[PDB]
Amino acid sequence: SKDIKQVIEIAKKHNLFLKEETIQFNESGLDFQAVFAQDNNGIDWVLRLPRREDVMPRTKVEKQALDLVNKYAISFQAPNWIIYTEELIAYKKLDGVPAGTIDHGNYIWEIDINNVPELFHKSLGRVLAELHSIPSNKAAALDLVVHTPEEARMSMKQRMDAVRAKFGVGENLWNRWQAWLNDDDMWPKKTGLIHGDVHAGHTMIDKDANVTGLIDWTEAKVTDVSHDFIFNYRAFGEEGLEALILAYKEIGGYYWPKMKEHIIELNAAYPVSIAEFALVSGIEEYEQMAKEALEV
Ligand SMILES: CC[C@H]1OC(=O)[C@H](C)[C@@H](O[C@H]2C[C@@](C)(OC)[C@@H](O)[C@H](C)O2)[C@H](C)[C@@H](O[C@@H]2O[C@H](C)C[C@H](N(C)C)[C@H]2O)[C@](C)(OC)C[C@@H](C)C(=O)[C@H](C)[C@@H](O)[C@]1(C)O
Ligand SMILES: Nc1nc2c(ncn2[C@@H]2O[C@H](COP(=O)(O)OP(=O)(O)O)[C@@H](O)[C@H]2O)c(=O)[nH]1
Ligand SMILES: [Mg+2]
Ligand SMILES: [Mg+2]
């Protein structure tokens, strides 16, 4: 195959020598095609073949976030792009498997959704508490979005007005959104470095369902940490949200009395993210997903 021979040559050009029979393709990918391959010392790698120009400006923020994680974090792994060029990005595969993969819509689960091991919530609590306390201020140059607690609140307020302008928002839903925005007690008084896209496809687990790593850091930023709890609530209901909040609080993560209620209101604002995604991607189902999510 030509594809295979191409993978081999781009790797070879970056001093990566692979077993040809181990090369698997993960279908593009507007930005890049993911390729998995084992080098000749037997080490599993992940390759990102770029499909757009300006790889460096487009990956700058994700790389800065990864540099912070690889410099500070010990409880979990993250991609370490030891090959980082316009022609190729490559990192040694993280240990474990995704807790679940998105259907190519629904999850194909690796854990028992009806009997979630408590170690998943315990280890994820430790992982996010460490992540969210990484000292991103100590970096000389950070191009991530950085919110104070009040900036994180206005950001949501503005993002909500913009979605209402392009799609409209159901009256009951909009009133809920506004009530949340206008409740001082609910909002966190501390922000932190977040992953931004925490879900089962990005949480690497070992055999015991300990979360051992996190992939795909494109949504990283310094803002409300609550975004990283939403998956537990969507996938596992109130029990899994509480279990995660409990472990995060007891290992030292920033906790506030209305944390659960705040995260649940952030969940009701998920149509904002779906609307925003439908806007910068043009994929037809997400417009219908957006419109139906907005109750319009
Ligand atoms: C429980 C089960 C359901 O899972 C979820 O609710 C997750 C916990 C989501 O994260 C929640 C929580 C959230 C924080 O993200 C992790 C939040 O941003 C998001 C909108 O919804 C997803 C992972 C969202 O993806 C994310 O949508 C973003 C718009 C862009 C992100 N990425 C940069 C490409 C992308 O991964 C997605 C839209 O679902 C609704 C994915 C879409 C394929 C579906 O509709 C799925 C069929 C889902 O209904 C689901 C599997 O059945
Ligand atoms: N097991 C494992 N899978 C990975 C790793 N990196 C990427 N993948 C898989 O490849 C997919 C795409 O990688 P990702 O970084 O999320 O890029 P994107 O989803 O295409 O934008 C993921 O959903 C994973 O299933 C890794 O280190 N370990
Ligand atoms: Mg991904
Ligand atoms: Mg991404």
CB 257 within 8 A of CB 245: no
In contact, 279 and 291? CB cutoff 8 Å: no
| DSSP letters spanning 138-164 | G-S---S-B--HHHHHHHHHHHHHHHH
- Could you tell me if 203 and 178 are in contact, meaning their C-beta atoms sit under 8 angstroms apart? no
Domains contained in the chain, number: 2
The string over 250-289, giving b where at least 16 C-beta atoms fall within 10 Å of a residue's C-beta and e elsewhere, is: eeebbeeeebbebbbbbeebebbbbbbebeeeeeeebbeb
Q: What angle do CA 106, 112, 115 make, to 5 degrees?
A: 125
CATH number at residue 167: 3.90.1200.10
Cα–Cα distances in angstroms (integers) from residue 245 to residues 158, 194, 251, in the given order = 27, 15, 10
What atom in ligand 1 is closest to the CA of residue 230? Answer: 12
Q: Give the C-alpha separation, 213 to 70, whole Å.
A: 11
Resolution at which this structure was determined, Å:
2.1
Give the containing element (helix H, strand E) for 84: strand 83-84
33 in ligand 2 pocket by Cβ < 6 Å?
Answer: no
User: What DSSP line would sit under 188-199, residue for residue?
Assistant: -S--EEE-S--S
Active site residue 112: no
Choice among 197, 208, 224, 228 that is catalytic: 197
Atom of ligand 2 nearest to the CA of 26: 10
- Rounded to an integer, what distance in angstroms lies between the CA atom of residue 70 and that of residue 73? 6
Residues near ligand 1 (Cβ within 6 A): 102, 105-107, 197-199, 219, 227, 230-231, 234-235, 270, 273-274, 277
SS3 per residue for 198-216: CCCCCEEECCCCCEEEECC
In the reported structure, the alpha carbon of residue 216 is separated from the centroid of ligand 2 by a whole-number distance in angstroms of 7
Query: Measured in angstroms, how far is the CA atom of residue 202 from the centroid of ligand 4?
Result: 9
Number of other CB atoms surrounding residue 41 within 10 Å: 6
Asked, as a colleague might, if the bond just before 96 is cis with ω within 30 of 0, I would say: no
> Does 202 carry a binding-site annotation?
yes
46 Cβ closer than 6 Å to some ligand 2 atom: yes
CB within 8 Å of 84: residues ≥ 6 apart = 59, 63
Quick one: which of 161, 152, 230, 156 has its CA closest to 192? 152
Ligand at shortest distance from the CA of 31: 2
Q: DSSP states of 3-60 as a string?
A: HHHHHHHHHHHTT--B-GGG-EE----SSEEEEEEEBTTS-EEEEEEE-SS-HHHHHH
Report the separation in Å between the CA atom of 196 and the middle of ligand 3, taken as the mean of its atom positions.
Answer: 11
User: Do 86 and 19 fall within a single domain?
Assistant: yes
Give the CA dihedral 266, 204, 290, 65, nearest 10 degrees. Answer: 70
Both 20 and 154 in one domain: the answer is no
262 vs 185: CA distance, rounded Å = 9
Q: Are residues 87 and 169 in the same domain?
A: no
Among candidate residues 92, 120, 138, the one where a domain is terminated: 92
Region of 209 please: left (phi>0), alpha (psi -120 to 50) or beta: left
Residue 57 sits in a domain whose CATH number is 3.30.200.20
Give the structural domain span for 21: 2-92
Q: Which secondary-structure segment (H or E) carries 92?
A: strand 89-92
Cα atoms in the 13 Å half-sphere on the side-chain side of 51: 11
In the block, tokens 């949340």 appear at: 180
